[PDB]
Design a protein around this motif. Structure first.
Motif, PDB file in Angstrom:
ATOM      1  N   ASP A  96       1.819  13.802 -12.446  1.00 20.04           N
ATOM      2  CA  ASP A  96       1.911  15.121 -13.089  1.00 20.04           C
ATOM      3  C   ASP A  96       2.228  16.222 -12.075  1.00 20.04           C
ATOM      4  N   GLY A  97       3.058  15.891 -11.087  1.00 23.16           N
ATOM      5  CA  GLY A  97       3.384  16.832 -10.037  1.00 23.16           C
ATOM      6  C   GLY A  97       2.291  17.070  -9.021  1.00 23.16           C
ATOM      7  N   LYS A  98       1.236  16.260  -9.023  1.00 27.94           N
ATOM      8  CA  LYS A  98       0.113  16.430  -8.115  1.00 27.94           C
ATOM      9  C   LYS A  98      -0.039  15.196  -7.239  1.00 27.94           C
ATOM     10  N   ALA A  99      -0.493  15.407  -6.010  1.00 27.91           N
ATOM     11  CA  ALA A  99      -0.728  14.321  -5.069  1.00 27.91           C
ATOM     12  C   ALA A  99      -2.196  13.921  -5.129  1.00 27.91           C
ATOM     13  N   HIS A 100      -2.457  12.682  -5.533  1.00 27.93           N
ATOM     14  CA  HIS A 100      -3.801  12.125  -5.569  1.00 27.93           C
ATOM     15  C   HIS A 100      -3.996  11.252  -4.337  1.00 27.93           C
ATOM     16  N   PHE A 101      -5.064  11.529  -3.587  1.00 30.74           N
ATOM     17  CA  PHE A 101      -5.504  10.827  -2.396  1.00 30.74           C
ATOM     18  C   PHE A 101      -6.832  10.137  -2.676  1.00 30.74           C
ATOM     19  N   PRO A 102      -7.085   8.959  -2.102  1.00 29.78           N
ATOM     20  CA  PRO A 102      -8.346   8.268  -2.389  1.00 29.78           C
ATOM     21  C   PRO A 102      -9.523   8.940  -1.699  1.00 29.78           C
ATOM     22  N   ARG A 103     -10.653   8.988  -2.408  1.00 30.09           N
ATOM     23  CA  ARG A 103     -11.873   9.538  -1.826  1.00 30.09           C
ATOM     24  C   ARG A 103     -12.406   8.622  -0.733  1.00 30.09           C
ATOM     25  N   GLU A 104     -12.700   7.377  -1.085  1.00 31.77           N
ATOM     26  CA  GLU A 104     -12.985   6.329  -0.119  1.00 31.77           C
ATOM     27  C   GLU A 104     -12.255   5.065  -0.550  1.00 31.77           C
ATOM     28  N   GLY A 105     -11.721   4.334   0.427  1.00 34.49           N
ATOM     29  CA  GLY A 105     -10.950   3.141   0.154  1.00 34.49           C
ATOM     30  C   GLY A 105      -9.472   3.353   0.432  1.00 34.49           C
ATOM     31  N   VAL A 106      -8.644   2.621  -0.309  1.00 36.82           N
ATOM     32  CA  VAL A 106      -7.213   2.552  -0.048  1.00 36.82           C
ATOM     33  C   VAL A 106      -6.525   2.075  -1.322  1.00 36.82           C
ATOM     34  N   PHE A 107      -5.321   2.595  -1.561  1.00 39.94           N
ATOM     35  CA  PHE A 107      -4.490   2.131  -2.662  1.00 39.94           C
ATOM     36  C   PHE A 107      -3.782   0.843  -2.269  1.00 39.94           C
ATOM     37  N   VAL A 108      -3.848  -0.159  -3.144  1.00 37.92           N
ATOM     38  CA  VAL A 108      -3.121  -1.410  -2.981  1.00 37.92           C
ATOM     39  C   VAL A 108      -2.434  -1.740  -4.297  1.00 37.92           C
ATOM     40  N   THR A 149       0.827  -1.197   0.000  1.00 44.78           N
ATOM     41  CA  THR A 149       0.000   0.000   0.000  1.00 44.78           C
ATOM     42  C   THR A 149       0.866   1.254   0.000  1.00 44.78           C
ATOM     43  N   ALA A 150       0.269   2.352  -0.452  1.00 42.13           N
ATOM     44  CA  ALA A 150       0.886   3.668  -0.469  1.00 42.13           C
ATOM     45  C   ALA A 150      -0.153   4.703  -0.061  1.00 42.13           C
ATOM     46  N   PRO A 151       0.257   5.770   0.634  1.00 41.20           N
ATOM     47  CA  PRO A 151      -0.737   6.753   1.091  1.00 41.20           C
ATOM     48  C   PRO A 151      -1.255   7.664  -0.007  1.00 41.20           C
ATOM     49  N   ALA A 152      -0.442   7.984  -1.010  1.00 37.80           N
ATOM     50  CA  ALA A 152      -0.858   8.886  -2.075  1.00 37.80           C
ATOM     51  C   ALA A 152      -0.071   8.555  -3.333  1.00 37.80           C
ATOM     52  N   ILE A 153      -0.508   9.118  -4.459  1.00 42.19           N
ATOM     53  CA  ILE A 153       0.139   8.878  -5.746  1.00 42.19           C
ATOM     54  C   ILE A 153       0.559  10.208  -6.355  1.00 42.19           C
TER      55      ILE A 153
END
Ligand SMILES: *[C@@H]1O[C@H](CO)[C@@H](O[C@@H]2O[C@H](CO)[C@@H](O)[C@H](O)[C@H]2NC(C)=O)[C@H](O)[C@H]1NC(C)=O
Ligand SMILES: *[C@@H]1O[C@H](CO)[C@@H](O)[C@H](O)[C@H]1NC(C)=O
Ligand SMILES: *[C@@H]1O[C@H](CO)[C@@H](O)[C@H](O)[C@H]1NC(C)=O
Lengths: 99, 107, 9
Positions: B42-54, B35-39
């Motif tokens: 393009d120089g921008k931090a994407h955070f999940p709305r609901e759920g989690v990155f796996v 897992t990772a907290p953000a992605i």
């Protein structure tokens, strides 16, 4: 030569039984609860333990109070420093005041 | 009311008492993931709305917390907050946008 | 959507 009240309570038929759970087992239960709630969160109370990084379950716990999770990820060091300072202040308050 | 996430409860009478039947929800079969907290895209931090990155080793997905339902990473279920030089543990991946292919096809 | 239309035009 300085007789205490414990022998007088003993010699009149008033006894005190020891508890079933010794303090070593109470400390073991407390350590098990802390190790469950640090590495897993609330998941160890429903089913099995579900591992998760700490800075991600803290971001889960900010979502329960109406704060979006970027607040943690842009201010992780300040929140960690505040938690460490609060823990140290709790230690100093328990060391100083005995009441 | 029971162990696990509570769903329903039913009452029954008893001699000098009441008896509850608690229908709950317990997860059963687990699987390890990375897992990772953000992605950073393009120089921008994407955070999940609901759920989690796996991730399954190669590709990155986003899923709900209490079930394994992997979805492709999209601008619909992620939101942008700041640059990607401040989050500790941020990884590099692309984020799909459904508006761009339809906008190009209208051209 | 209208800046995308401006870039479209
Ligand atoms: C991780 O998951 C992805 C998608 O779920 C897998 O990518 C697909 O793998 C199948 C294997 O049969 C291929 O037929 C598909 O073409 C792949 N998708 C794409 C877009 O190429 C990937 O193989 C998985 N990796 C691991 C290590 O399990
Ligand atoms: C996950 O990884 C750990 C690493 O020690 C392993 O013990 C465990 O069996 C793996 N699977 C699950 C479902 O926890
Ligand atoms: C992600 O990309 C940027 C620039 O392309 C790079 O500086 C950074 O090291 C990359 N992240 C990782 C984990 O390699």
């Amino acid at each position: 030569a300085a007789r205490d009240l414990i022998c007088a309570q003993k010699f009149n038929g008033l006894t005190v039984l020891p508890p079933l759970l010794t303090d070593e087992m109470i400390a073991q239960y407390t350590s098990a609860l802390l190790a469950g709630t640090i590495t897993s969160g609330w998941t160890f109370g429903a089913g099995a333990a579900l591992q998760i990084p700490f800075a991600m379950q803290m971001a889960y716990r900010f979502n329960g109070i109406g704060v979006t999770q970027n607040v943690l990820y842009e201010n992780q060091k300040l929140i960690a420093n505040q938690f460490n300072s609060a823990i140290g202040k709790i230690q100093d308050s328990l060391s100083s005041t005995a009441s | 009311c029971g162990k696990g996430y509570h769903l329903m409860s039913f009452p029954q009478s008893a001699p000098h008492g009441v008896v509850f039947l608690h229908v709950t929800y317990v997860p059963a079969q687990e699987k390890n993931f990375t897992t990772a907290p953000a992605i950073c895209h393009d120089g921008k931090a994407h955070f999940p709305r609901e759920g989690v990155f796996v991730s399954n080793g190669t590709h990155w997905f986003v899923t709900q917390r209490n079930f394994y339902e992997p979805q492709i990473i999209t601008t619909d279920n992620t939101f942008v907050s700041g640059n990607c030089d401040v989050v500790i543990g941020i990884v590099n991946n692309t984020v799909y946008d459904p508006l761009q292919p339809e906008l190009d096809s209208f051209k």
